[PDB]
Design a protein around this ligand. Structure first.
Ligand SMILES: *CC(=O)N[C@H]1C[C@H](n2cc(C)c(=O)[nH]c2=O)O[C@@H]1CO
Ligand SMILES: *CC(=O)N[C@H]1C[C@H](n2cc(C)c(=O)[nH]c2=O)O[C@@H]1CO
Lengths: 124, 124
């Protein structure tokens, strides 16, 4: 029942924080965003910028997405992001993640009218 | 009839250089390693480290792979990498890429006997 855009926000936006607070950031967020519900989602990235700032990427540098289609866009500037990666030890339902904070360019897949981010392609 | 190990070396290893020479590195390498043969491969990463240093990652930090498997490992130290991303104006056969040189941790998938990298999962 969520739109593609609402789904993108749930999964990948964390405007409320400038950066991953601690080593436990991912353990907390993966769970509160419902990404640990039926199974441990293995990888996920949260962007720490305003929604408008992220929506603006859809008119920035046009690039190929991982699938070869060209509805992907690379941000002009670096953005604050947190990478969450399931660790070796992790066992549903006690899903465990490694938290990495970085300043990188983002690449998103855009769709619709208005043209907004619907998928997180990669960080560079 | 190429081995998984040899395919990983051809598509993801560039030990002969410490880093991407120029802005043109990706255009040249994607073509020489045959990744632009029938189509423009949209994304690719090259690691500028010795084979020995990359094979050693198979015994470093165990993490989940993108696909959920648990035969993935993250290097403890950053390594010299080159990110290749197909631009929005690229049209086969004139595949065009954007070159990004950086120092990042790598995540590889390992298999076989001996236990070596066979797939490049991501850089972090
Ligand atoms: C949270 C999220 O965006 N997951 C995405 C990433 C990946 N994806 C899909 C498309 C269509 C693309 O162009 N590039 C990507 O990286 O798929 C998940 C959704 O299926
Ligand atoms: C050159 C290369 O490694 N391509 C890989 C990237 C991706 N992949 C596969 C597996 C099995 C994995 O665990 N993690 C990945 O990122 O798919 C290509 C394999 O054809």
């Amino acid at each position: 029942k969520e739109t593609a855009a609402a789904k993108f926000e749930r999964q990948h936006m964390d405007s409320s924080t400038s950066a991953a607070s601690s080593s436990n950031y991912c353990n907390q967020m993966m769970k509160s965003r419902n990404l640990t519900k039926d199974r441990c989602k293995p990888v996920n990235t949260f962007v720490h910028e305003s929604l408008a700032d992220v929506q603006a990427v859809c008119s920035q540098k046009n690039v190929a997405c991982k699938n070869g289609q060209t509805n992907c866009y690379q941000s002009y500037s670096t953005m604050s992001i947190t990478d969450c990666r399931e660790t070796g030890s992790s066992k549903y339902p006690n899903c465990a993640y490694k938290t990495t904070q970085a300043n990188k360019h983002i690449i998103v897949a855009c769709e619709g009218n208005p043209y907004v981010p619907v998928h997180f392609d990669a960080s560079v």
